[PDB]
Write a protein that binds this ligand. Structure first.
Ligand code: TSU
Ligand code: TSU
Lengths: 45, 45
């Protein structure tokens, strides 16, 4: 599951993932990857 | 040429670009593409 800081970070991640892998795009867009079922509140998007 | 707003934006763009195209990564990372050789001072990174 990806968890991003803001809507800007979410649109970064989703566009990046068109060609890019999860870990690569999480680091580019400052999102968090988690195996949890919900995101922490600091990374809600 | 790619022109980014910040160091974080440049990092974003460079990572995205490992597998993504220029236009897509510029949109994701909020950078601008220019045909010229000078970046707008608003997009200096
Ligand atoms: C392009 C972009 C802008 C801002 C962020 S954020 O500050 O991590 O939400 C991530 C990605
Ligand atoms: C991750 C990240 C944070 C912030 C930006 S920027 O606001 O476009 O400089 C781009 C990318």
């Amino acid at each position: 599951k990806s968890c991003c800081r803001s809507t800007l970070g979410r649109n970064c991640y989703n566009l990046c993932r068109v060609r890019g892998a999860q870990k690569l795009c999480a680091n580019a867009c400052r999102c968090k990857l988690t195996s949890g079922l919900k995101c922490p509140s600091s990374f809600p998007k």
